Design a protein around this nucleic acid. Sequence first.
RNA 1: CUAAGAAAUUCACGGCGGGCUUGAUGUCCGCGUCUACCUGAUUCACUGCCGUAUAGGCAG
Length: 108
Amino acid sequence: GNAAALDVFKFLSLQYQGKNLLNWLTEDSAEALQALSDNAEQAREWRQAFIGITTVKGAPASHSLAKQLYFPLPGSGYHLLAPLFPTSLVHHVHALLREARFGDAAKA
RNA sequence: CUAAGAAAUUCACGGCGGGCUUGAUGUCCGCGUCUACCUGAUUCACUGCCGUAUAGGCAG
């Protein structure tokens, strides 16, 4: 999304009590939905806004510039199989490679 | 029915200034290489004659 809009993500990435405020907003809790408000229904619509950062917006779509690749089924069929780029897996493998190449226990 | 399908890197250029690598040196003792064979498979497609012949035949 927008790079100037990442203040919401820096606000959601806080580890205030023992966990993220995101997962505190997923489950029903008394400390949740009451700290950030003085009205009830306003806190409900703020929850339904703030929990929507993990929900896909819009109809499912893969662009013409995106990749989608037929896969033959065992009987006579095909599935379209549009693959996406795993940025979390690339970030995990990239962190593993930087830790194995540049880490303190590797430099030792 | 292929991480499918698509694509102009390109223009120009002074690397050269200079130089002592030197001395010195024990390679060295010793040694069983034997054994046994078909080059011959048509392996020399030859030399010459009659004929105008390259076509064809003939002699040794």
